[PDB]
């Protein structure tokens, strides 16, 4: 029993973290085989950030201008190239700790683990979700750029996020490992803001199923709803629309608990309309939306890596 | 910016997890140098759990009755001994991945990371706290026994907890790495229950200071309090007494924010009286007690916003 915000074990990613320095800028890099991946803004000064011409700044640089440090060892840069907002530094040493991996782009609502790093040294691991507005509610300080997000499937690490910046509201923005940003963001110092966010409905439903599995049923009722009627109330409370795909995905949890997805939707509707009335669900007074249906099934089954 | 329940990177502990089997029982062990540490109840059947005589069960075992598996490799047991509720299995191979470590016994209120494991394989990492009633609100299924709790400071892993059992209320009990239980618990299936739990006051205060550092001050007031008056009100809401030690420990956060500890105590008193009125503090609708003053200083910026 018990339900916690659980991250994947970080060991396979810790053995890939390095420090990248170019001029006065120091951030983190991801060392896989003989390439070090890092945000391209490592080549910028503070004045360059306003309107940087990355292809012009990069030509000025030679291999020896990039200082890469893996633990207490200097890696020698032998090549460099840019792919979208990610800089790829070819080093003269393949990482002996390179795990089996893939680069994957995730969708809003999907969760992942973040290994927060400073000066190429991992400091902490936490779980988060890609919000519908494409930002993440992370915890990062100056020097955290280049820290990565990932999921593990069997023995394969799927890298899905690289940290680039913090927005004025304290939320974070970054790219996939191919350098494509999540959201309408750019890697410059310009006026940028997170869009209005919404709640991840399929995740709140998954978490309500996790509460039932852990013996919390007070919110269950005898009623049901249609998908259309539920979506009319969900949009009213700034919740993402629930699709037939979300209903299908919740199928197994509905069969394990004996509570149909639209029956759980009726419970969610009443929670939105009446509140919790001094009660909690899994120790929370808010409806939690950062656990996917797969996360709930995995934590209530004991899948190992 | 941001504030998350952050765990330590788990890699150093992942390289120590092994599977220990004795008869029909399989659980996790911690392999450090040439010793595998695990709960002594690995030698018990379900019948034995009512009134086990561990000395009597152990004398009937030989080294070859214990099967230890590290990855896909069998370790050969060459010695065994019991120390309190922990079984120490001497193996003929020192763990080449043994980190720099120490065994530390923690006090209630202290936090640590747990690496939940099944069959010697890590599945997830999460942060938790030793409750005032010496239990932990973990997330553990059958087969998780032997999973460990730890902190990491400057590359040294301090092991503070080993998982032994789940109590009837869904909470968890275990030992330090010398086999001494936290709390009045026994590794016996008997009528034992977690005592009434309380809120960790010094941690709630630390978290209120984390909110001020991150820019939120809505909960402050113009009042102060005496330590005695604060404790009389705190005990009515099931909060632990605040000692002069806790006031001393909060000194640095009081100096970084300019808010005296007894001034923050007055804010906590008012929060207990009024609730949050639809507002949140660091994204929570409840007062959070699983971040220590040390955790807040480690995660938060040294510059207040
Ligand atoms: O100082 C800057 C300038 N940035 C321009 C800029 C423009 C474009 C790009 Cl792609 C990156 C960046 C950098 C950037 O966002 N870095 C950071 C990333 N994650 C967390 C951070 C936490 C504190 C500081 C920086 C952080 C740097 N901003 C700033 C922001 C957020 C707070 S919160 C307190 N101080 C700041 C100060
Ligand atoms: O079946 C038992 C017997 N235990 C007695 C017993 C007595 C003393 C000692 Cl030192 C160890 C143990 C074992 C024990 O607590 N094992 C476990 C440890 N951590 C999490 C667990 C999560 C589910 C299951 C077992 C778990 C075994 N209990 C039980 C409890 C909690 C739920 S929740 C659903 N089923 C159970 C069933
Ligand atoms: Cl302690």
From Swiss-Prot, chains A, B:
Cleaves the C-terminus of replicase polyprotein at 11 sites. Recognizes substrates containing the core sequence [ILMVF]-Q-|-[SGACN]. Cleaves and inactivates human TRMT1, preventing tRNA guanine(26)-dimethylation of tRNAs. May cleave human NLRP1 in lung epithelial cells, thereby activating the NLRP1 inflammasome pathway. May cleave human GSDMD, triggering alternative GSDME-mediated epithelial cell death upon activation of the NLRP1 inflammasome, which may enhance the release interleukins 1B, 6, 16 and 18. Also able to bind an ADP-ribose-1''-phosphate (ADRP). Coiled coil: none annotated. The lineage of its organism: Viruses, Riboviria, Orthornavirae, Pisuviricota, Pisoniviricetes. It is found in: Host cytoplasm; Host Golgi apparatus; Host nucleus. The active site is at 41 (for 3cl-pro activity), 145 (nucleophile). It catalyses: TSAVLQ-|-SGFRK-NH2 and SGVTFQ-|-GKFKK the two peptides corresponding to the two self-cleavage sites of the SARS 3C-like proteinase are the two most reactive peptide substrates. The enzyme exhibits a strong preference for substrates containing Gln at P1 position and Leu at P2 position. Inhibited by pyridone-containing alpha-ketoamides compounds 13a and 13b. In turn, alpha-ketoamide 13b (tert-butyl (1-((S)-1-(((S)-4-(benzylamino)-3,4-dioxo-1-((S)-2-oxopyrrolidin-3-yl)butan-2-yl)amino)-3-cyclopropyl-1-oxopropan-2-yl)-2-oxo-1,2-dihydropyridin-3-yl)carbamate) inhibits SARS-CoV-2 replication in human lung cells. Inhibited ex vivo by michael acceptor inhibitor N3. Inhibited ex vivo by compound 11a and 11b. There is a cross-link at residues 5, 90 (Glycyl lysine isopeptide (Lys-Gly) (interchain with G-Cter in ubiquitin)). The chain holds residues 3264 to 3568 of 7096 of the full protein. 3CL-PRO exists as monomer and homodimer. Only the homodimer shows catalytic activity. Interacts with host FBXO22; this interaction promotes the proteasomal degradation of nsp5. Changing residue 205 to V: In strain: Zeta/P.2. This is 3C-like proteinase nsp5. Residues 1-305 form the Peptidase C30 domain. It comes from Severe acute respiratory syndrome coronavirus 2 (2019-nCoV). Residues 1-305 are cytoplasmic.
């Amino acid at each position: 029993s018990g339900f916690r915000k659980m991250a994947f074990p970080s060991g396979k990613v810790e053995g890939c973290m390095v420090q990248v320095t170019c001029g006065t800028t120091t951030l983190n890099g991801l060392w896989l085989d003989d390439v070090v991946y890092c945000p391209r803004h490592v080549i910028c000064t503070s004045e360059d950030m306003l309107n940087p011409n990355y292809e012009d700044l990069l030509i000025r640089k030679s291999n020896h201008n990039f200082l890469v440090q893996a633990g207490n060892v200097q890696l020698r840069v032998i090549g460099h190239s840019m792919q979208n907002c990610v800089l790829k530094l070819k080093v003269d040493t393949a990482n002996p700790k390179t795990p089996k991996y893939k680069f994957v782009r995730i969708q809003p609502g999907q969760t992942f683990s973040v290994l927060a790093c400073y000066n190429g040294s991992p400091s902490g691991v936490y779980q988060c979700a890609m919000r519908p507005n494409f930002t993440i509610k992370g915890s990062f300080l100056n020097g955290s750029c280049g820290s990565v997000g990932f999921n593990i499937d069997y023995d394969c690490v799927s890298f899905c996020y690289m940290h680039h910046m913090e927005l004025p509201t304290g939320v974070h923005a970054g790219t996939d490992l191919e350098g494509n940003f999540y959201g309408p963001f750019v890697d410059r110092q310009t006026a940028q803001a997170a869009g209005t966010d919404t709640t991840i409905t399929v995740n709140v439903l998954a978490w309500l199923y996790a509460a039932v599995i852990n013996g919390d049923r007070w919110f269950l009722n005898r009623f049901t709803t249609t998908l259309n009627d539920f979506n009319l109330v969900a949009m009213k409370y700034n919740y993402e629309p629930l699709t037939q795909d979300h209903v299908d995905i919740l199928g197994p949890l509905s069969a394990q608990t004996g509570i149909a997805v639209l029956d759980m939707c009726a419970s969610l509707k009443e929670l939105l309309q009446n509140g919790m009335n001094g009660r909690t669900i899994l120790g929370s007074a808010l409806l939690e939306d950062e656990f996917t249906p797969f996360d709930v099934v995995r934590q209530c089954s004991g899948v190992t890596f």
